[PDB]
Amino acid sequence: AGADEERAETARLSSFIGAIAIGDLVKSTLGPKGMDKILLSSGRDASLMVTNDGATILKNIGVDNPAAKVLVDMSRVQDDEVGDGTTSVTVLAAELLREAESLIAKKIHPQTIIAGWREATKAARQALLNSAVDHGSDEVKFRQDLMNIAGTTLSSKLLTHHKDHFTKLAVEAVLRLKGSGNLEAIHVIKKLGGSLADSYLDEGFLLDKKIGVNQPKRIENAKILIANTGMDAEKEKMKEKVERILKHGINCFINRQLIYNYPEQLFGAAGVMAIEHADFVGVERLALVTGGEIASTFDHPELVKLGSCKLIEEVMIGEDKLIHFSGVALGEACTIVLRGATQQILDEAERSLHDALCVLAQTVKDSRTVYGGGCSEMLMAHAVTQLASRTPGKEAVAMESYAKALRMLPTIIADNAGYDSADLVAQLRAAHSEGKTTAGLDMKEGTIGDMSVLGITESFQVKRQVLLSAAEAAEVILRVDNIIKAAPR
Amino acid sequence: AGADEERAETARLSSFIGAIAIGDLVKSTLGPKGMDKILLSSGRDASLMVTNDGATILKNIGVDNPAAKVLVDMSRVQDDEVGDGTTSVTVLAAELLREAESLIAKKIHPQTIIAGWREATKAARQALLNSAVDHGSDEVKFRQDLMNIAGTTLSSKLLTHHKDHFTKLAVEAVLRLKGSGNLEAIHVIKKLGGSLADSYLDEGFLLDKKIGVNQPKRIENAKILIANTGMDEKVERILKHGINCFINRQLIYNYPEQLFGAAGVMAIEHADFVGVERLALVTGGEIASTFDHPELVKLGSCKLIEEVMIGEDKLIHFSGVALGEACTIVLRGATQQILDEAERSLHDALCVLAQTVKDSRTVYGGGCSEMLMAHAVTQLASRTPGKEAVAMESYAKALRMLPTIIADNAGYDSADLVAQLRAAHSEGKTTAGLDMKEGTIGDMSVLGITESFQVKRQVLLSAAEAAEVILRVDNIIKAAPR
Amino acid sequence: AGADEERAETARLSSFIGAIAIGDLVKSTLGPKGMDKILLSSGRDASLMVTNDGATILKNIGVDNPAAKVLVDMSRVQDDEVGDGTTSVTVLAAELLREAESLIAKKIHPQTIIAGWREATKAARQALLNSAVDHGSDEVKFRQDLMNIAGTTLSSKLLTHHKDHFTKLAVEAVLRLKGSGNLEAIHVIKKLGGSLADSYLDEGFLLDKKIGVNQPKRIENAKILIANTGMDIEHAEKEKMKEKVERILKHGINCFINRQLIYNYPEQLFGAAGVMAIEHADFVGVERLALVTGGEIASTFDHPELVKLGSCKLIEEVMIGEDKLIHFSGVALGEACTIVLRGATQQILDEAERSLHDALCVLAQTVKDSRTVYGGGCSEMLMAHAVTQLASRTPGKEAVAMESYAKALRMLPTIIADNAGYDSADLVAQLRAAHSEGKTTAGLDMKEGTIGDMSVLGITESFQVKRQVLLSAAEAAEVILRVDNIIKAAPR
């Protein structure tokens, strides 16, 4: 008959239900002992996908009408900002909705209560001044570079047997990236072949193509040629390419498409390595790296093109054949390569590096971090309980509810571990209350322990953005009472 | 039929439903501007009954199968010990059940949570000590004797125009009681007569019975005779003793009646047993059996027994008891719905402040006690280990509703009230509380409203044990209306 | 949004039902006494098919909605390593699910229980150390080459009267193949027409194709040509003809094998030359054969002489009781050989195809491992006695999960006895007393109805079959229970 209409308490309920459904699935995926989840869907799915990253799975699908997709969409902007470690920001937003049950008892104006969000700003910043944070990584740093936050991101993920080693590698990659440049030229790829190292580092850019079985194994003081057009009377074509080639000393040719067979015989004898159907996206990054070139007709060699002469070679990774470009003069652009166990757990690493590279970039800019494993959450909770009573009252109603929202974070960490959640809460509050910031939830123990020995740390950046953002994501939904007058029909 | 057994959610549900149904009706009653309700029942009641006092209506009727009657039955023992004034204890027990729906999320063991009840006992003792109570009320006292708690008990009642004066009088009655002997021998009745005072204080015991048309009008240096067995030998035993009055708890045979008139002895036909039992303690007692009962077996006090006119109608008074352990109270009323209410109020008044001289401790009224207690209970949950804390912290916000109910009956918006209330209590001023006449927060002490320390200690334990018996135990349930 | 969302208990139920549904049909299959079972379906299913192999029927059809096909698919990779014996891996994986009902009562994180599988690895390798393991195959081996495990694999099979004889033959085949990296070029099929042997051994590799009715009847010291590209105005055609004849002649070419369609013109040429060619030869046959011959490089018609490697002994078309088949033989390599099965002509004949897969993998393993364990469930009861101690030994959560895994082993003795035709209850306790005492040889005797000496029977299971099954069962069960979501992901 018309538009979707909900009034008073019913409008509140739709938002309320969406938050509870998401929280139970996400809880098992938090901190150093999370659970892998496999998802099955019909049509245009073709099977099951398993994601250990909460943000990636929510973005992909809009299962039903109940509002949550827009809230979910927001987490990605956060991902660019800092994004991860462990997924948990979504869970905290969900918790605040449980409170609205006691609100009906309040019975007057729900938006006056919204002052809690005003309060949230005051409560949020008490964690952004208080704690113990850390002494931030000064720059490059020999051993404080990793085996810390990256490991924690990994710990919720099972592959952390071989994988924690990979995580250690990521900081080295960020160090070259470090300073004023921001994020550019990082694409990193993985393979179906297993090796103990499970990762190779490249000075320049990494591809995955071979000229053919024949051709010189290694090229040095290399000249690089990039052609927009394909190589696809015939002898005349052959000759133009060879005469221009020999004078230059051309060491490598890269073409973004199919390549005609005659050129291939020529390149092998000359001592020149060529690449068939190189993807266009890889090529654009390479141009910035080598100083660039103008890609025209076979006239394209000589001065219309600029070449970087350090080291280009093709080596066998272990199973799959790849080609290594390195020693770029520009230095601005670099490439990371990962190896793995070989199943799906490995593809997880594909998921992990994208998340890991950006967080580290923020780590150098922030120069501040906080203890992980929920150590940060309990300390703040002790401080916030005191605050509600102290404020006059309108302020107090609002302030106290926010404070108890912090409490199940310890619970969520412990619950996914496989230990009794209430028991965990009892011991945890006492250690934080005493004054030890290092102490936190230890999932491996089943109780609590020293977070620092683990080396688990969370970026200072994740805590400031979540606190301000959580209030805003929750506030929009709660602030508006009754939604009516819309449907197209 | 017969016995029943209960399953997971349904068992909890039966207890859960009982608490919510009773909370709403009792809710209007609390506070100075509470309102009366009238109930009619299924053929054993005879008519419409209106009771301002929450406890009286619940005791009289066992409406349905759900566990509530045993919870309800307990409130009267509380009344005996102290719990009266305004009904609040039942309300307090009832919202603890709401927390249980939240508790389903708490997937572990509900009984573990139960450990919270003596944690709560710690909370009761945490509450007691941590809250400035009072330092006044030395004994008898010129002005702190009342114009305090009785007035608040009365405040929830409309009568408080002429009636607040009556409440002040109640303390004089306790003043004569203080000493060694306990709380006993208090009886109150009302009469048809208009007066601004609306009461008189009487020294002796009030009774209203007469032997017959003939007999001496007044007896002097009276001896009292009590017989367990009915009249349905007497002169010979009587003359030697010098008996002046005979009291029998039952029907009296006609033949002896002629004898008593000529002798000059006043007898009482069908005297009620409750007055008689008290009397035995009063007169030194007697051994009540068959007609052998006279002389030494019985002891009789002997000041004066006479029939006196009390303003209007004629009444008989027993006074001048040698023992000194028992007394009686008589009230005269203008007549209205609220005067026999004094029956309700005096019974309650006696327990509230007799207790007050014994305690030497009281707390500020008008909800001053509840917000302060709420302020310090929140810290305590955090102070205690965390799973203990989860149960303890839920208890702490429970106290929040009392401030809201006090204000709500006043006529002022509840949201604003909660807000202004907490800031004054948090600051450290115990005297400050909810001033309903203001609609805001004010000085409770100026009002003169104070609560007996026992009402607060006793309510806490009574609520804890009563709440504990629910969540714990199965065997009940509810079905359909009327 | 056709996504399937499963909730805690419901999530177990889909999988729980899938495990129970498959368990009953597979159960009758195990032991010396088994049930044949045939299935009929509408739409591109002309007639009933009989499966004495739990694995074969499960792979062919994905009958219902509930997840189990991937679990089912996995059993075949097992088949490559060891496979057969009797179908027990699926049964054991399913039995673990039934005590999960007990787990709801426990009412804690289900994943905590998962520690039992790690516990299972301990149990899995104690299937080792609890065996004195035969002592010495001695490679090749005179008398105990077979009349052992193959017989057990076939004991459940209906054909055990005549067929136990062909099972015996299978080990001779493995002996030829020694250099025990299981199988290269081992291809055997069932053939029509009866014989007492019900099987024949060919020194070479079989096939089922002919060039044409005309051509020389047979070839000697034959050279083999294999072409990737097909043989597929007249004067232009003749040149194509000439290239093929001019260089074919120098070699002395006796046989040509091409995988795909063959052009008609060369066919006349081959007959006069004295060369036998094969039209549309199957690719799978061709490279295994190539391993046998010495591996050629297949290019364009330049392919003759050296770029082709031809082994020469005897290539001929030989009448085999029935039809008439093409046989390649006398391979120099010796590494790869072919066994040809024959039968009366029974659906049960199709049994041999199953049996073959079963025969090849276990025997190859038996020679490399030089270790094996007693069959008939001897291994299973002994392991069960040890695991009971483990449950009591470990505190709290670990004992509950370890204990449940331990009782799972108890059911296998019951299934072994149940298919026998004897009372299962009596069998279980008598069995436990002999294993507890310390006799590894003692085990379930299905014909006996009671417990007996397994070694006399000759039934033994490869050391690999026991270590891998136990690890595999754990992983198969873990993929479901371990993960509590199963929802969303795919734009639409």
Swiss-Prot record, chain C:
SUPFAM superfamilies: GroEL apical domain-like, GroEL equatorial domain-like, GroEL-intermediate domain like. The keyword Acetylation applies. InterPro entries: Chap_CCT_beta, Chaperone_TCP-1, Chaperonin_TCP-1_CS, Cpn60/GroEL/TCP-1, GroEL-like_apical_dom_sf, GROEL-like_equatorial_sf, TCP-1-like_intermed_sf, TCP-1_chaperonin. It catalyses: ATP + H2O = ADP + phosphate + H(+). This is T-complex protein 1 subunit beta. Signal peptide: none annotated. Mg(2+) binds at D84. ATP binds at G31, G85, T86, T87, E461, K466. Belongs to the TCP-1 chaperonin family. Component of the chaperonin-containing T-complex (TRiC), a hexadecamer composed of two identical back-to-back stacked rings enclosing a protein folding chamber. Each ring is made up of eight different subunits: TCP1/CCT1, CCT2, CCT3, CCT4, CCT5, CCT6A/CCT6, CCT7, CCT8. Interacts with PACRG. Interacts with FLCN. Interacts with DLEC1. Interacts with SVEP1. It comes from the Eukaryota. Disulfide bonds: none annotated. Its EC number is 3.6.1.-. It is found in: Cytoplasm. It holds the Pfam family Cpn60_TCP1. Its main location: cytoplasm. ADP binds at G31, G85, T86, T87, S88, S155, S156, G376, E461, K466. It is an enzyme of class 3 (hydrolase). One of its GO terms (molecular function) is ATP hydrolysis activity. The modification Phosphoserine is found at S47. One of its GO terms (cellular component) is microtubule. The modification N6-acetyllysine is found at K141, K168. Component of the chaperonin-containing T-complex (TRiC), a molecular chaperone complex that assists the folding of actin, tubulin and other proteins upon ATP hydrolysis. The TRiC complex mediates the folding of WRAP53/TCAB1, thereby regulating telomere maintenance. As part of the TRiC complex may play a role in the assembly of BBSome, a complex involved in ciliogenesis regulating transports vesicles to the cilia. GO terms for biological process: binding of sperm to zona pellucida; chaperone mediated protein folding independent of cofactor; chaperone-mediated protein complex assembly; positive regulation of telomerase RNA localization to Cajal body; positive regulation of telomere maintenance via telomerase; protein folding; protein stabilization; scaRNA localization to Cajal body. Keywords: Acetylation, ATP-binding, Chaperone, Cytoplasm, Hydrolase, Isopeptide bond, Magnesium, Metal-binding, Nucleotide-binding, Phosphoprotein, Ubl conjugation.
